[PDB]
Design a protein around this ligand. Structure first.
Ligand SMILES: *[C@@](O)(c1nc2cc(I)ccc2s1)[C@@H](C[C@H]1CCNC1=O)NC(=O)[C@@H]1[C@@H]2[C@H](CN1C(=O)[C@@H](NC(=O)C(F)(F)F)C(C)(C)C)C2(C)C
Ligand SMILES: *[C@@](O)(c1nc2cc(I)ccc2s1)[C@@H](C[C@H]1CCNC1=O)NC(=O)[C@@H]1[C@@H]2[C@H](CN1C(=O)[C@@H](NC(=O)C(F)(F)F)C(C)(C)C)C2(C)C
Lengths: 306, 306
């Protein structure tokens, strides 16, 4: 049936994207009900970004200083406040296209769809994981800030990411929708790098199950292993420890394919120690770690409106 | 800045998806203005699909036999006709969410976004290429039929694919929106396989340019080559011939990076002959051929509403 990096359909979020301009600085914002959420550094010029005092820049602004555009309709701002690294702009019109929604803070290892936007207008959608080092491997240019990441579950959009910045090796950092950074990063143009990343073990195992489901089974061996013994090995290759919680979350896939989790662990142990020997799994030459157990079930069970 | 398999934002097409039921068979349809387009085999039961006579099945149907649902609103059908492998259902309500749109027949090598749908409801979006053998490497389950592929250009959705069937090695076949199959495939459950596939040379070159743009340049050599000499080599590794038209289409990327097309050809020739030596290009261990020159520019230049 096939297996692809699938993004959540983006319509629900496209209806919420707007452009926010303060002075000559413009970026994206998220219009939910009568509030627009955008990165606080919309209030910054070039100069300001080496070392901004945001409380200071902001006190010098007033409501009318923020130009909010939904398409070519302007929205009138009637209040503003800063929450962490995010600015909230109260507008006098509720977004009629607001979907049912929640703000969530995802954990390292969870995947989400990014709607990359420029000028309040949607460029594309793609799927990402929050890496263990709290970066995302994105695709973002100048003007993408305020682009958002999200999950859908039936009718409900859980927004979990807002884009702020690009770190030295071409990866990305940002906040939840309460303006709290993932990872130890700050919103200033100063030198910062991600710590060392690690592979999301549980996701690799999920992807292996997806391969069994798709009939790609060559890598299955005859062995089992213990959780402890598996994890000593994983450690060497810079894989996350697999926890009981991760084992439990793989339970659906385990039960569908009839392969015990620790049996799949034994197969992965071998792949880490022997390599793939120029073979692919699901068309791919490396082990993939940006599919969660839920992503595999969704794609393999056909879960819709999400 | 990063480089991902980016899909077109799907909102414009999500607003057009509906469920079509005839008897006990249900699949997806596309509601544009006052017409619903769906695969003609909505008129088939299990039995019928070994060897269907579609003109015969259809003459026995009337308008009221087709249950069209947009969400939980039913649409009243007032006419029907078959065009090739597609059924057109005239309904008495125009879809107010119809975007500006065109039907196009893409060429082998062009990419598009698939909105995978079940029960007239959107499951996910992903990017695909029309392979030289006229299949797509999709991700599709039972009930996905009538899912559509499309490009966006500013406000305009060009629909180029409608999903019909899955071929032996887990790849996919379907029609344009006039119901004409890509490739020599037919809509019956009979034995059919894709011919041998080939790599889309021009797309590989475009992706290499994307890598140079992203600062991944290790694979650039000091050489040039002729088009003829390049193509003799490509042939051995089962790459499409590169034409002057393909050279011309790579002109923007060539000019932006300052690397002549035939110089990039020389670098690819080496990669085909030497392999990648356990190195990656843009995180990937294999050469990727499902990005067009336009896809690279769009993603690298930040082109929106598309
Ligand atoms: C973004 O879109 C924003 N652009 C601007 C421009 C102005 I004038 C004011 C505020 C903002 S937010 C986004 C840009 C793109 C840039 C390339 N890839 C992205 O993801 N954000 C930034 O430019 C942020 C912003 C400044 C500096 N910055 C960075 O991403 C920079 N990174 C860093 O300095 C480091 F910490 F290493 F990550 C840089 C531009 C990539 C060098 C803020 C406030 C951090
Ligand atoms: C699709 O969603 C449809 N399902 C039905 C069910 C009925 I009853 C009537 C009409 C349709 S269209 C889609 C299904 C999924 C199936 C798994 N992956 C897909 O892409 N289409 C089909 O089931 C089509 C349909 C029958 C047989 N068929 C196939 O895809 C089959 N392939 C072939 O026989 C072969 F030619 F090799 F490709 C099969 C189900 C994968 C074995 C039509 C009319 C071709």
């Amino acid at each position: 049936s096939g297996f692809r990096k699938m993004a959540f359909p983006s319509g629900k979020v496209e209806g919420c994207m707007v452009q926010v301009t303060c002075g000559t600085t413009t970026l994206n914002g998220l219009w939910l009900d009568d509030v627009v959420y955008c990165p606080r550094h919309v209030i910054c010029t070039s100069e300001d970004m080496l070392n901004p005092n945001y409380e200071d820049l902001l006190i010098r602004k007033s409501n009318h200083n923020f130009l909010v555009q939904a398409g070519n309709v302007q929205l009138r701002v009637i209040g503003h406040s800063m929450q962490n690294c995010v600015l909230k702009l109260k507008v006098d019109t509720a977004n009629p296209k607001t979907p049912k929604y929640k703000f969530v803070r995802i954990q390292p290892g969870q995947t989400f769809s990014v709607l990359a936007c420029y000028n309040g207008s949607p460029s594309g959608v793609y799927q990402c994981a929050m890496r263990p080092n709290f970066t995302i491997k994105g695709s973002f240019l100048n003007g993408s800030c305020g682009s958002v990441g999200f999950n859908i579950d039936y009718d409900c959009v859980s927004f979990c990411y807002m884009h702020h910045m690009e770190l030295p090796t071409g990866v990305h950092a940002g906040t939840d929708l309460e303006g709290n950074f993932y990872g130890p990063f700050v919103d200033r143009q100063t030198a910062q790098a991600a710590g060392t990343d690690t592979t999301i073990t549980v996701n690799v195992l999920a992807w292996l199950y997806a391969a069994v489901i798709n009939g790609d089974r060559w890598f299955l061996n005859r062995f089992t292993t213990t959780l402890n013994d598996f994890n000593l090995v994983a450690m060497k290759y810079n894989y996350e420890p697999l926890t009981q919680d991760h084992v439990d979350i793989l339970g659906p896939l385990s039960a569908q394919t009839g392969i015990a989790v620790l049996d799949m662990c034994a197969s992965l142990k071998e792949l880490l120690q022997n390599g793939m020997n120029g073979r692919t799994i699901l068309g791919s030459a490396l082990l993939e770690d940006e599919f969660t157990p839920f992503d595999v079930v969704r794609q393999c069970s056909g879960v819709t409106f999400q």
